[PDB]
Amino acid sequence: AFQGMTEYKLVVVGAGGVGKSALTIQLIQNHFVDEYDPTIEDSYRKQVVIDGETCLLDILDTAGHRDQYMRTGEGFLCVFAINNTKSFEDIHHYREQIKRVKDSEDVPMVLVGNKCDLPSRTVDTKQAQDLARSYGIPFIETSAKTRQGVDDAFYTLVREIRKHK
Amino acid sequence: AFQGMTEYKLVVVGAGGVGKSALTIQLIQNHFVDEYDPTIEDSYRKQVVIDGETCLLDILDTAGHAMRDQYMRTGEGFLCVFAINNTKSFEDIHHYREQIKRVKDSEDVPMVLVGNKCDLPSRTVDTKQAQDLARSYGIPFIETSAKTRQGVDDAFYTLVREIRKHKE
Amino acid sequence: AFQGMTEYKLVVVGAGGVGKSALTIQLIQNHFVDEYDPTIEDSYRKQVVIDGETCLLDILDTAGAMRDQYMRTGEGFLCVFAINNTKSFEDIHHYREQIKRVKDSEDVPMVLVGNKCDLPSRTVDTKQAQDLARSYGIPFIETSAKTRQGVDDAFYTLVREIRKHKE
Amino acid sequence: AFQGMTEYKLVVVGAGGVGKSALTIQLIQNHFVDEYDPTIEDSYRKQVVIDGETCLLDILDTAGHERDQYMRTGEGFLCVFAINNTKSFEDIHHYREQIKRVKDSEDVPMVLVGNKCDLPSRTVDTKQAQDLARSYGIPFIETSAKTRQGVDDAFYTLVREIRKHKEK
Amino acid sequence: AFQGMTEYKLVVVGAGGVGKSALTIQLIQNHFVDEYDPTIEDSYRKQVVIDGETCLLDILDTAGHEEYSAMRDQYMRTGEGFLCVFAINNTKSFEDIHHYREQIKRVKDSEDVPMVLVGNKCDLPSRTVDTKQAQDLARSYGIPFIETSAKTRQGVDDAFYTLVREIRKHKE
Amino acid sequence: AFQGMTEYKLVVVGAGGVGKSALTIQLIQNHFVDEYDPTIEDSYRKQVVIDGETCLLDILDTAGHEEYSAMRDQYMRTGEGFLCVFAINNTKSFEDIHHYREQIKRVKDSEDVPMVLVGNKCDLPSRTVDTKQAQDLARSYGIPFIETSAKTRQGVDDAFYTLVREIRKHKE
Ligand SMILES: Nc1nc2c(ncn2[C@@H]2O[C@H](COP(=O)(O)OP(=O)(O)NP(=O)(O)O)[C@@H](O)[C@H]2O)c(=O)[nH]1
Ligand SMILES: Nc1nc2c(ncn2[C@@H]2O[C@H](COP(=O)(O)OP(=O)(O)NP(=O)(O)O)[C@@H](O)[C@H]2O)c(=O)[nH]1
Ligand SMILES: Nc1nc2c(ncn2[C@@H]2O[C@H](COP(=O)(O)OP(=O)(O)NP(=O)(O)O)[C@@H](O)[C@H]2O)c(=O)[nH]1
Ligand SMILES: Nc1nc2c(ncn2[C@@H]2O[C@H](COP(=O)(O)OP(=O)(O)NP(=O)(O)O)[C@@H](O)[C@H]2O)c(=O)[nH]1
Ligand SMILES: Nc1nc2c(ncn2[C@@H]2O[C@H](COP(=O)(O)OP(=O)(O)NP(=O)(O)O)[C@@H](O)[C@H]2O)c(=O)[nH]1
Ligand SMILES: Nc1nc2c(ncn2[C@@H]2O[C@H](COP(=O)(O)OP(=O)(O)NP(=O)(O)O)[C@@H](O)[C@H]2O)c(=O)[nH]1
Ligand SMILES: COc1cc(-c2cccc3c2OCCO3)ccc1Nc1cccc(CN(C)C)c1
Ligand SMILES: COc1cc(-c2cccc3c2OCCO3)ccc1Nc1cccc(CN(C)C)c1
Ligand SMILES: COc1cc(-c2cccc3c2OCCO3)ccc1Nc1cccc(CN(C)C)c1
Ligand SMILES: COc1cc(-c2cccc3c2OCCO3)ccc1Nc1cccc(CN(C)C)c1
Ligand SMILES: [Mg+2]
Ligand SMILES: [Mg+2]
Ligand SMILES: [Mg+2]
Ligand SMILES: [Mg+2]
Ligand SMILES: [Mg+2]
Ligand SMILES: [Mg+2]
C-alpha cells in the first residue's frame, strides 16, 4: 500500500548571514525577509510536485554558529554569499562536518551561492563551479531577494536525494 | 511566521472487522479493500483542504483487539467505528470512548461516531439509535460505506472540524 | 531528464450496453449519461494523481482488425459486464482470450468490472465474479456509473496494475 | 481582457424540505446535514473546473415558502423536488412559471432535480419526471444529498446549460 | 457553517504611470504589459493559498488621477487593504504616497488601515528613490515595504500576499 | 461532449546557443541548465492553466543549425505556434529571426502564423540588441515581443502563455 506522499528531510547550512533563512522563507511564504534575525533552529514544511512526483519537504533552517540534525538530514544545501569570500572558504568545513557525522563520502548536497543580486561580487562563478565539480555536486546561484534560483536549489537537492536512493 | 500547513493526528478505533482499514484506505487511495487482513498498527498521511484551510492528516489505523495507551495520548481526534450489521460492535463503542477519556484525562475529547457498512442489507442497528447515542455523547454521527465511499470524506473532515472547535 | 508526465493507455471492453461509455463519461465529466447511444470508438484524456504520481490517462472506449489494433496498443484493460445480464458476464472470457492472443501473454494488466450495481435485478452473484477474477489473477470491482460507486477505483486500480507489470 | 475566472450565479429553488440546503452543503463541505433547519437566504461560493474551464459558482440557497430580486439576478436555476413528496413535484410548475415571468423569457437555463433518491418511499416515478423535463426542454437528474449521488452532476450540468444559453 | 473561501478586497493606488495595472496583470495573467493604457477602473479576481488558507482576492485597479472624487471615496470605503505604489525612478510618485495614505485614513476614519508600500520598477537603472528612504517612510507608518518589478515579477506575489497577511492581523 | 483538455503544439526555433532548450527546461523542470548540449530534436509536455482554460502544451525544441530536412519541414507544418528566439548579446541571432520567420511562412503557406519574438539572455551585461529595435521588428511582423532570461526565469511563463493566447486568437 501507498501510505502518503514521499517525505524529504532537507537541512540548510552555512555561515552566519549568508541568507539561509531568507532562502527558506522565500520558498515557504513567497516573502523576502529584510531584517537580520539570527536563527537558533526552525522547521518548515511544504508540499510540491517535482518531476511529476508529489512530495513533502521538511526543511531545517540552522544557525550560522548540531550533530543531531546532521544525522537526521537526507540532503544539505551548503550556502555561501557571493559577496563574502570567507563564507565560501567555510563551505569546505560544513561539507567535512556533514561527512563525519553521517560517516559517508556520498551525501546528497547542493552548493548555493546566494545574494547574486548584489553588485559587490567577490566569488567568481567559475571558482564556485570548480569547487562543486571537485565535490561531485551541483552548483546554483540564488537570490532570496529576487527569488532567482530558489525553487531550483531545493528541487535540485530533491533530485540528488532521489538519485542516491 | 507560518511554518507549514496545520497537522492533525487522527486515530481510528473500534471492534474487529468493522472496516477501520477499509475506511482509511478508501480515503487515502480511493480503493475498496475486499480482503480482511487484520491490522496491528498502520500509519497514513494525506494533505487536504477543509473549509479553506490546507492541512495534513496523520491517520493511525488501530487493531480490533501500553502501545494502546501510547496512541490514545498522541491522538487529537478519534473516529469511533461500528458496523451497522453487528450489534456487538455498536455496544462496544462505549468502551472505546471510556478508554480514550481515561488516557487523556478529559471529558471533552474530539470524536466522531461512524456507522460503517451502510450499503449492506443486513442492518441490525437503527440510525435513530446511533444518532441518540451520539447526541448523548455530544458528538456527530455519520453513516459510511467504505465500499460505495458514502460518507468517508465527511467522517474524516467532520473530525477535523471537531478538533478545530476544541482548540479555540 | 523528466520531459512531461507519464501517459497510460487504457481500453474499456465488454458487451453492448454494459455501461462502458457511462463509466468513462462519469470519470471524465462527472456526468451520468442516461441515453444509450452505441459507440464505434471514442477517445478520452484525463490528468490525475495516483499514489503521488501525476499521469495522463488515454482512454479508449470500444464498441460492444480495428479491434486487434487497439488490443495491441493498450497497456491495460477494463473488462466490463453488467450484474443484471448473465450473458455479458459469460462473454468476459471471450474478451480476455482475445486480449491474451493479440498481446501474446498470460499476464496482461486487467481489471474485472461488474457494473450497474445500483439496479435491483441482480443475476450475477458477487462471489461468482470474485471467483472468476481470482482464477484470472486480477482484481474485481463493483461499479455503478449512475451512483459513481467504484468508478475512480476501477481506473486507478488498472493504473496500479500497469505499474506493477512494468517493474 | 481576461480579469479572473468566469462567475456563474446559480439559484436553488423548490418547496420546503426537499433538500435544497442539503444539496448545496454537500457540494460545498462534503457534509450531509441530518437536521432540518429552515433557511431564510444563504450564499455560497465554490471554485471548480468544468470541461477544462475554471469557474466560480455563486450559489443562492432559497427558502421553501418566502424573491423577485434573486430571480432577476440568477443566471441558472436548480428546480428541486423530493421523489417521496408528490406535492413538491407538482409545485415545480409554479417555480418554473415564476422564474419565466421575472426574467421575461421562455429559454432560462434550468435543471430539474429529483432529490432523496436513496429513500425507498418513492411516490414520483422517474418516467413522469423525465416527461416533465422533456416538455420544458431541460435536463433531469436524480440526486441524493445523503449518498452524494448526482450532486456534482446537477450543479455542473446547470453550468453547462448556462454556457449553452450564452453562445448566441 | 463554512460557506466558501474568505474574500479580501484589495485596492491598488498611486500616481499615474507607476505600474498599478502592470503589477495586477502580472499577478493574474503572468504577463508583462509594455504599453501604457491609462486605467479608469478595472476589477480582477484570483484564488490563492496564503499561509495555508485559501482565499479569493478581489482586486480593484484604480486610475492615477481621478476624474471625480465621489467614485474615489467609494472604493476607499469598500477596500479592506491598500497597495500604495510608487515608481523608484519618479520622486514625485513617492512624495504623493503620503497624500494617498491620508485620504484613505480620513475616509475610513482610522489610524490603523491595512496597507503596504510598494516601490515598483526596481528593474530600471534610473533610480531616484533610495531603498533606505522608502524603508524609513514605511517604518514611520508602521507598514511593510516591498520592492517590485512588474517586468521581472520580483516581489509581485509578495506584495499582494503581504497585504492579505496585514488584513488578517487587523481582523484578529 | 468534452473529451479532455485542449492541446497546443508549440515549436521553439532560433539560432544555435540562444537558449531554446534552457527556456523549455526552465518551464518544465524549474531548472537552469548551465551546460551547452546541442539539440537535435526533443519533445516536452506540460499542463497549465491560461486565462482559466486548462491545457496541455506539447513543445518541440529544435536544433540551431540544420541544413534542409524534410523531417524538419514536417514538424513546422504540424506546429500551431512558434517561439522565435534570439539572444540579446548576439546580433547575428537577431538577424537570423527574419530567416526563421520566412521558413515558417513558406511551409505553412500563410502570412498570419501565431508567433512570438523572444529576446533571451536579458540577464547578461553584454547587450548588443536594443529592446526598441526588437520591439520595432515585432511591431513590423504584427506579433508580440518578450524579454526573457532562462537563468533568472524572467518572462519564461509569459513567453509560452503569450504564444498560446496568440494561437487562440488565430482560431476565433
Ligand atoms: N540582497 C540580498 N540580501 C539578502 C539575500 N539573502 C539574505 N539577505 C539579507 O541578508 C541578511 C541575513 O539573512 P538571513 O536569512 O538572516 O541569513 P542567515 O544565514 O539565516 N543568518 P543566521 O545564520 O544568523 O541564521 C538579511 O538582512 C537578509 O535580508 C539575497 O539573496 N539578496
Ligand atoms: N460491504 C461492505 N464491506 C465492508 C465495508 N467496510 C469494510 N468491509 C469489509 O469488512 C471486512 C473488514 O474490513 P477491515 O477494514 O479489514 O476491518 P478492520 O476494522 O480494519 N478489522 P481489524 O480490527 O482486524 O483491523 C473486509 O472484508 C472488508 O472488505 C463496507 O463499508 N461495506
Ligand atoms: N442504472 C444504471 N444504468 C446504467 C449504468 N451504466 C450504464 N447504464 C445505462 O445503460 C445504458 C448503456 O450505457 P452505455 O454506457 O451506452 O453502454 P455501452 O457499454 O457503452 N454500450 P456500447 O458497447 O454500445 O458502446 C445507458 O442508458 C446508461 O444510462 C449503471 O451503472 N447503472
Ligand atoms: N434521505 C435523504 N434525506 C434528505 C435528503 N436531502 C435532505 N434530507 C433531509 O431532509 C430534511 C430537509 O433538508 P433541507 O436541506 O433542510 O431542505 P430545504 O429544501 O432546504 N428546506 P427549506 O426550504 O426550509 O430551507 C433534512 O432533514 C435533511 O437531512 C436526501 O437526499 N436523502
Ligand atoms: N521596466 C518597467 N516598466 C514598468 C513596470 N511597471 C510598469 N511599467 C511600465 O510603466 C508604464 C505604466 O504602467 P501601468 O501599469 O499602465 O501604470 P498605471 O499605474 O496603471 N497607470 P494609470 O494610473 O494611468 O492606470 C507601462 O509602460 C508599463 O509597461 C516595471 O516594473 N518595470
Ligand atoms: N546567462 C544566460 N545564459 C543562458 C540563457 N539561456 C541559455 N543560456 C546558456 O546558453 C548556452 C546555450 O543554451 P541552450 O538552451 O543549450 O541553447 P540552444 O538554443 O538550445 N542551443 P542548440 O540550438 O544548439 O540546441 C548554455 O550554456 C546556457 O546555460 C539566459 O537566459 N541567460
Ligand atoms: C508524526 O508521524 C505520524 C503520526 C501518526 C499518529 C497519529 C495519531 C496517533 C499517533 C501517531 O503516531 C505515533 C503514535 O500515535 C500517524 C502517521 C505518521 N506518519 C506517517 C507519514 C507517512 C507514512 C507513514 C508510514 N510509515 C509507517 C512507513 C507514517
Ligand atoms: C495517444 O492518443 C490517444 C490514444 C488513446 C488510446 C488508448 C488505448 C489504445 C489506443 C488508443 O489510441 C487508438 C487505438 O489504441 C486514447 C486517446 C488518445 N488521445 C487523445 C488526446 C486528447 C484528446 C483526445 C480526444 N480526441 C477525440 C480529440 C484524445
Ligand atoms: C464583488 O465584486 C467585485 C468587487 C471588487 C472590489 C474590490 C475592492 C474595492 C471595491 C470593489 O468594487 C467596487 C468598489 O470597491 C472587485 C472585483 C469584483 N468582481 C469581479 C471579478 C472578476 C471579474 C470582474 C470583471 N467583470 C465585470 C468583467 C469583476
Ligand atoms: C503528440 O504529442 C506531442 C507533440 C509535439 C509537437 C509539438 C509541436 C509540433 C509538433 C509536435 O509533434 C508532431 C510534429 O509537430 C511535441 C510533444 C508531444 N508529446 C510528448 C511530449 C513529451 C513526451 C512524450 C512521450 N515521449 C516522446 C517520451 C510525448
Ligand atoms: Mg537564519
Ligand atoms: Mg484494521
Ligand atoms: Mg458505449
Ligand atoms: Mg434549507
Ligand atoms: Mg493602470
Ligand atoms: Mg538546445
Residue numbers in the entry:
A (entry chain D): -3 to 61, 68 to 167
B (entry chain F): -3 to 61, 66 to 168
C (entry chain C): -3 to 60, 66 to 168
D (entry chain E): -3 to 62, 68 to 169
E (entry chain B), F (entry chain A): -3 to 168
List sentences from the manuscript.
A group of proteins known as the RAS family plays a critical role in controlling animal cell growth and division. RAS is a membrane-bound small GTPase switching between an inactive GDP-bound state and an active GTP-bound state. RAS signaling to the cell nucleus occurs after interaction of RAS-GTP with its effectors to trigger the activation of downstream signaling pathways. The KRAS, NRAS and HRAS family members are conserved proteins that have an almost identical amino-acid domain (G domain) from residues 1–166 but a C-terminal hypervariable domain.
We have further used this methodology to test a RAS-binding compound (herein referred to as 3344) that we have derived from an in vitro medicinal chemistry programme starting with an intracellular antibody fragment. Our major purpose in the development of the RAS BRET2 biosensors was to create a validation tool for compounds that bind to RAS and interfere with its PPI in living cells. We have identified compounds that bind to KRAS using in vitro screening and one compound 3344 (chemical structure and 1-D NMR characterization shown in Figure 1—figure supplement 3A–C) binds to KRASG12V with an affinity of 126 nM using 1H Carr-Purcell-Meiboom-Gill (CPMG) NMR (data are shown in Figure 1—figure supplement 3D). The mechanism of the interaction inhibition was corroborated by X-ray crystallography of KRASQ61H soaked with compound 3344. For X-ray diffraction experiments, KRASQ61H-GppNHp crystals were grown by vapour diffusion at 4°C by mixing 1.5 + 1.5 volumes of KRAS solution at a concentration of 75 mg/mL KRASQ61H, with 8–15% w/v Polyethylene Glycol 3350 and 0.2 M lithium citrate pH 5.5. Crystal Form I (KRASQ61H) has six KRAS molecules in the asymmetric unit, assembled as a hexamer. 3344 binds to a hydrophobic pocket near to the effector-binding switch regions of RAS. Whereas 3344 does not make direct contact with the switch regions, the BRET data show that the binding geometry and potency of 3344 is sufficient to interfere with the interaction of RAS-effector molecules that bind close to the 3344 site. The superimposition of the structures of three RAS-effector protein complexes with the structure of KRAS-3344 complex shows that parts of 3344 would overlap with the bound effector structures, suggesting that the competition effect of 3344 can be explained by straightforward steric hindrance. Therefore, the BRET-based RAS biosensors characterization of 3344 shows this compound as a pan-RAS-effector interactions inhibitor that binds KRAS, NRAS and HRAS.
